[PDB]
Amino acid sequence: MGAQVSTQKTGAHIIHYTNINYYKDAASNSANRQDFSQDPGKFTEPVKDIMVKSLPALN
Amino acid sequence: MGAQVSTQKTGAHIIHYTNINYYKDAASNSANRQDFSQDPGKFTEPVKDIMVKSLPALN
Amino acid sequence: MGAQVSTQKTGAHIIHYTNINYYKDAASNSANRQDFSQDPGKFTEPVKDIMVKSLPALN
Amino acid sequence: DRVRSITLGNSTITTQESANVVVAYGRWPEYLKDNEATAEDQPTQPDVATCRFYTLESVTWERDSPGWWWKFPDALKDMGLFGQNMYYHYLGRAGYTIHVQCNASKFHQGCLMVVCVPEAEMGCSQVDGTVNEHSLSEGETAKKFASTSTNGTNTVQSIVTNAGMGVGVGNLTIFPHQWINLRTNNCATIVMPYINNVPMDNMFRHHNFTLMIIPFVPLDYSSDSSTYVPITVTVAPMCAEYNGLRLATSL
Amino acid sequence: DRVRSITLGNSTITTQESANVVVAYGRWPEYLKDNEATAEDQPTQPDVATCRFYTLESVTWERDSPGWWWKFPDALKDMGLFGQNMYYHYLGRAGYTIHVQCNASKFHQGCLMVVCVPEAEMGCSQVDGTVNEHSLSEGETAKKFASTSTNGTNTVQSIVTNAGMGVGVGNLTIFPHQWINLRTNNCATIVMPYINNVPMDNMFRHHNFTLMIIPFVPLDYSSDSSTYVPITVTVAPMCAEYNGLRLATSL
Amino acid sequence: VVEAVENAVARVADTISSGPSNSQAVPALTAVETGHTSQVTPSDTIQTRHVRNYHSRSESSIENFLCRSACVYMGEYHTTNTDTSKLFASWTINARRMVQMRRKLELFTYVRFDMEVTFVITSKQDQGTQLGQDMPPLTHQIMYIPPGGPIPKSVTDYTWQTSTNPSIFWTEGNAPPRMSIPFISIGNAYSNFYDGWSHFSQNGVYGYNTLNHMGQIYVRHVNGSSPLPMTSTVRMYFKPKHVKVWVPRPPRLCQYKNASTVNFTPTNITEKRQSINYIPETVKP
């Protein structure tokens, strides 16, 4: 009946849960707490020419 | 991990959600808001012989 | 994204929902309200020899 | 179908008027397994010196008798090698077979309830007070239920209708039980497994279950029928295990 | 090779300094078969209430101790359900496991002979006389051999050299036996089958065998070593059977 | 990713059609002496029609029966006094002081579950002759102390540092605070009844208090203020989830007396009527 089943946050070294949406608007849904992407190069490496890190930066 | 994924209530003219059950008793689950069945003939047509609606009711 | 989709509680005579788990511990999940098992013979028939119910109990 | 024989160790019980056998919750006694143990030393298992029928002393069923109870263990702490293995170890574990006998003639009448109650915690006749262990148990001698409300200090509130636990006595059928109806049968038999919230326990500190014998229909008879009608209990431990050997405790 | 464990019923014996086990004549105890029976009624077999280790009371081994003896059965007639099954039947039959314990330090010395004698018929200290049963046995208490010739009436002629039977004591090795040498081992074990000229017998009337413990090398020790050295016996019946149920006899 | 989880609905048994009979089968004759309860249905004693039954036993499962919030404790504390012990509230944790939840729990011998805990805090002004002042929002602190931890002596004690104890800080006008607790017991399941002692000599403390030992709760005002005194009341609510129970018992008949014992006053079995045949007549013109 439009049920979503997904995994729970556990540790490392039965574990899933169920959700049903009750309302017609998506602004009524609960938060999206399980999306973990990254793109740090946008802020730390914003240069036109690539820098190898074992080579000198100049010359 | 026992996750249920089902569709959300939208309009007509990304749209699903996730649920996990945390407790051992089913009386702890949330309401079943997305079941829409009907059977009106039980109250509006409770007669032994069928009535066609283009034919006369009697004779 | 680890979403669980399962059926809602309806009547008899669109109906599913979505769940996502947000936390790392399973003690944070919601209750398990949709598990309905039974085993009454443990309390009503705890005898060593089987009793047929159409036969006499003794003799 | 009414005849039965039970053998344990070097002891045997025969009966010719039995109803059936109750297995407490569909579970037979058994030894502790490896994925449920916590104590690490190798346990001892005597297996015929402890697992056999011991007989307690009898009570007299009279025309106005309220009933009797015993506490297990602590009713078998002076019984042979079971009691000696109880005195030298810290942890013990066992199931039981209980057998109650009471015979009478076809001109007598009466009905008894035989019930085993796990964790039967009891209350004092003074509500602003606490109980002591002498009022709870006398070993192989039975405690006696009362006929009215009890008073005085240090005694247990023992009017039969509340079973000394604050409940209705007619609901005790939720526990493992049988009936002795004098026109039908003359013995009751219950097989009880080990029931606790921990896998082993100390046998002097904790009463695992109480045995209650309560007459619902009093004993009646006529002109020159026999007046003396006794009731007798016999108990046998099963799958007995002990852990933690040290010097013998002293009560 | 020196460690051993024996389980019977609900009882267990461990030992860490054993020699071996003697099986009386290469024959283990067993039940009576159909082509050797004469009594026709169905026999009872308790099987864990009777077949278990019972411990008698201990004796004190002193520097000048002649020795001790017991009679079997009649030393177990007040032991649990074995004794009760003895009192209600006319015929009984059983084998036995005997275990004798005596430990001491590596600075002590002494040597004991442990022997089982079938049909040990004894003589009176008065040659023109007859013996009585009190002089033959005291149940779980031991009779004591003497140091010289005995006199007076009604006592058994009990100087150790003749073993009270008119033989040489050094020849008793013809019977099933073991030795306890204090520098070597600390326990003896003998397994005895049923030995008689008839398949069953009455257990109050007939002594099937006598157990004798006789020191050949006396106990010796020095300045401040322990002086108290006890000896202990433990016996377990095996394959026990009874026939001929009637009312209980009275001695 | 999406995972479909199936839920089996469980309904009651249908009744089957049955006709006349004349035979040696005697389904209605039994013997209660065996300890067995008869499994006879109406179709074994009368003539029946076929009915398709759609009823479900969903609201009588243990989880739906026990998964509701109940009050277990209420307490008071002041912002200003002359006692310095009435400036904070403290209590030992159990579920034995409010009779409704505790009678509901005592239908079973052993229970095991996680918990959801909620707090409801309210404040009020103490009756004084001169009123009138504006007060900023009040903040409250709740600290849980497991057995063995140091105990506060006042509202300014160093122990409210809460370096390792878990605490809640809250301010009035917001939603009630809430948190979840796992199954914390040194045993394999909780024990509601204990027929034993604490000392091996069969004396000491008897019954329930031997086994619980689950810490304490302390609550205070954080502002340290209010020349005109105020008074707060805190209420605590428990809600069990992920439940398992064993060994059912007969429900409590007598009224409770205190939180430590099972002590009671003898009570009747029921109330009376006129005679063993009395019938109330309800069809009269």
CB distance F266–D210 less than 8 Å? no
CB E142 within 8 A of CB E230: no
Taking the C-alpha atoms of residue E200 and residue E90, their distance in angstroms, rounded to an integer, is 10
User: Residue A25: what residue type?
Assistant: D
Torsion, Cα of E148, E150, E151, E157 (10° steps)? -150
Q: Which of D12, D81, D240 minimises the CB distance to E52? A: D81
Nearest to F148 by CA among F219, F218, F220, F213: F213
Structure tokens at E2: 């020196």
Cα angle, residue E126 at apex, residues E121 and E131 outer, rounded to 5°: 40
- Determine the distance in angstroms separating the CA of A38 from the nearest CA of chain C, rounded to an integer: 16
Buried b (16+ CB within 10 A) or exposed e, D37-61: eeeeeebbbbbbbbbbbbbbeebeb
Provide the phi-psi class of D119: left if phi over 0, else alpha when psi is between -120 and 50, else beta: left
CB distance F1–A6 less than 8 Å? yes
Is the CA virtual torsion B21, B27, B31, B35 positive or negative?
A: positive
Taking the C-alpha atoms of residue F167 and residue D28, their distance in angstroms, rounded to an integer, is 47
- Determine the distance in angstroms separating the CA of B7 from the nearest CA of chain F, rounded to an integer: 11
Taking the C-alpha atoms of residue E70 and residue E194, their distance in angstroms, rounded to an integer, is 17
Taking the C-alpha atoms of residue D117 and residue F189, their distance in angstroms, rounded to an integer, is 19
SS3 labels along C1-59 = CCEEEEECCCCCCCCEEEECCCCCCHHHCCECECCCCCCCHHHHCCECCCCCCCCCCCC
Taking the C-alpha atoms of residue E72 and residue D14, their distance in angstroms, rounded to an integer, is 29
Taking the C-alpha atoms of residue D65 and residue D218, their distance in angstroms, rounded to an integer, is 8
Cα angle, residue D96 at apex, residues D90 and D97 outer, rounded to 5°: 160
User: Residue A15: what residue type?
Assistant: I
R_g over Cα of chain B: 22
Distances in Å between the Cα of B58 and the Cα atoms of B45, B46, B48 are 16, 16, 14
Q: In what order do the strands lie in the sheet with D68-72?
A: D143-144, D68-72, D209-220, D109-118, D177-181
Q: Which of F109, F250, F257 minimises the CB distance to D127? A: F257
Nearest to B24 by CA among F62, D240, E36, F153: F62
Taking the C-alpha atoms of residue E235 and residue E242, their distance in angstroms, rounded to an integer, is 19
Neighbours of chain F (3+ CB pairs under 8 A): A, B, C, D
Q: Which helix (H) or strand (E) covers residue F19, if one does? A: none
Structure tokens at D157: 């509130």
- Distance between the two ends of chain E, CA-based, in angstroms? 46
Taking the C-alpha atoms of residue F91 and residue F112, their distance in angstroms, rounded to an integer, is 23
Taking the C-alpha atoms of residue F88 and residue F218, their distance in angstroms, rounded to an integer, is 7
Find tokens 């020795």 and name the residue: E67
User: Residue E12: what residue type?
Assistant: T
Structure tokens at D99: 């057998």
F68 Cβ under 8 Å from any chain C Cβ? no
CB D211 within 8 A of CB D44: no
Taking the C-alpha atoms of residue E230 and residue E61, their distance in angstroms, rounded to an integer, is 6
Cα angle, residue C51 at apex, residues C45 and C55 outer, rounded to 5°: 145
Taking the C-alpha atoms of residue B35 and residue A1, their distance in angstroms, rounded to an integer, is 8
Taking the C-alpha atoms of residue F254 and residue F105, their distance in angstroms, rounded to an integer, is 16
A10 Cβ under 8 Å from any chain C Cβ? yes
Nearest to D216 by CA among D175, D173, D176, D187: D173
- Determine the distance in angstroms separating the CA of B52 from the nearest CA of chain F, rounded to an integer: 28
Nearest CA in chain B to C16: B6
Residue C4's DSSP bridge partners are C19, F3
Most B CBs within 10 A among C24, C34, C36, hence the mutation to make, goes to: C34
Taking the C-alpha atoms of residue D177 and residue D115, their distance in angstroms, rounded to an integer, is 4
Structure tokens at F133: 């002042």
Taking the C-alpha atoms of residue D103 and residue E191, their distance in angstroms, rounded to an integer, is 43
Taking the C-alpha atoms of residue D133 and residue F198, their distance in angstroms, rounded to an integer, is 12
- Backbone φ and ψ for E103, nearest 5 degrees, come out as -110, 155
Taking the C-alpha atoms of residue E193 and residue E32, their distance in angstroms, rounded to an integer, is 12
Q: Residue ranges per domain, chain F?
A: 1-285
CB atoms within 10 A of CB A14: 6
3-state secondary structure of E20: coil
Cα angle, residue D134 at apex, residues D131 and D137 outer, rounded to 5°: 100
User: Residue F19: what residue type?
Assistant: G
Taking the C-alpha atoms of residue D173 and residue D27, their distance in angstroms, rounded to an integer, is 18
Strands (E), F126-215: 139-145, 167-171, 178-181, 190-191
Bond into D73 cis (ω within 30): yes
Nearest to D161 by CA among D67, D28, D229, D38: D67
Q: How far from chain centre, in Å, is Cα D146?
A: 19
Structure tokens at D117: 């109650």
Q: Which of A17, A24, A25 minimises the CB distance to B20? A: A17
- Determine the distance in angstroms separating the CA of D238 from the nearest CA of chain E, rounded to an integer: 9
Find tokens 């026109």 and name the residue: D183
DSSP for E38-85, please give it.
---SPPB--EESSSS-EE---EE--TT---EEEEESSSSTTSHHHHHH
Structure tokens at A14: 């039965």
Bond into E73 cis (ω within 30): yes
Exposed, middle or buried: residue B59 (CB in 10 Å: 0-12, 13-18, 19+)? exposed
Taking the C-alpha atoms of residue B26 and residue B22, their distance in angstroms, rounded to an integer, is 10
Instruction: Name the experimental technique.
Output: cryo-EM
CB distance C20–A6 less than 8 Å? yes
CB distance C47–D184 less than 8 Å? no
CB atoms within 10 A of CB E77: 16
DSSP designation for E169: G
Taking the C-alpha atoms of residue B8 and residue C17, their distance in angstroms, rounded to an integer, is 7
Taking the C-alpha atoms of residue E158 and residue E67, their distance in angstroms, rounded to an integer, is 10
Buried b (16+ CB within 10 A) or exposed e, E162-171: ebbeeeebee
Give the domain range for residue A37: 1-59
3-state secondary structure of A20: coil
Structure tokens at D110: 């009466």
- D66 contacts in chain F (CB < 8 Å): none
Structure tokens at A50: 């690539």
Could you give the residue ranges of the DSSP H alpha helices within E95-142?
133-136
Structure tokens at F238: 């428990």
CB B48 within 8 A of CB C56: no
Taking the C-alpha atoms of residue E216 and residue E113, their distance in angstroms, rounded to an integer, is 7
Structure tokens at B37: 């069945």
Taking the C-alpha atoms of residue C50 and residue F34, their distance in angstroms, rounded to an integer, is 11
Structure tokens at F108: 């079973």
Report how many domains make up chain C.
Answer: 1
CB F79 within 8 A of CB F223: yes
R_g over Cα of chain E: 19
Nearest to B24 by CA among F246, F242, F116: F242
Look at strands E109-118 and E59-60 and give their pairing.
unpaired
Taking the C-alpha atoms of residue D33 and residue D25, their distance in angstroms, rounded to an integer, is 19
- Backbone φ and ψ for D34, nearest 5 degrees, come out as -75, -35
User: Residue F282: what residue type?
Assistant: T
Q: Which of F1, F5, F65 minimises the CB distance to B25? A: F65
DSSP designation for F135: -
- B34 contacts in chain A (CB < 8 Å): 1-2, 20-22
D49 Cβ under 8 Å from any chain F Cβ? no
Torsion, Cα of D131, D132, D135, D137 (10° steps)? 120
Taking the C-alpha atoms of residue A20 and residue A3, their distance in angstroms, rounded to an integer, is 5
Residues with their C more than 2.5 Å from the N of the next written residue in chain B, i.e. before a break, are 13
Distances in Å between the Cα of A42 and the Cα atoms of A47, A48, A51 are 9, 12, 14
Taking the C-alpha atoms of residue C10 and residue B36, their distance in angstroms, rounded to an integer, is 8
Q: How far from chain centre, in Å, is Cα D223?
A: 35
- D165 contacts in chain F (CB < 8 Å): 262
Structure tokens at C10: 């309806």
Taking the C-alpha atoms of residue F255 and residue F249, their distance in angstroms, rounded to an integer, is 16
CB F49 within 8 A of CB F17: yes
Find tokens 């020095």 and name the residue: E222
CB distance B27–F114 less than 8 Å? no
Structure tokens at D108: 């007598």
CB D187 within 8 A of CB D17: yes
Cα angle, residue F185 at apex, residues F183 and F186 outer, rounded to 5°: 140
Taking the C-alpha atoms of residue B2 and residue D247, their distance in angstroms, rounded to an integer, is 53
Taking the C-alpha atoms of residue F256 and residue F254, their distance in angstroms, rounded to an integer, is 7
F271 Cβ under 8 Å from any chain D Cβ? no
Look at strands D68-72 and E54-55 and give their pairing.
unpaired
CB distance D48–E9 less than 8 Å? yes
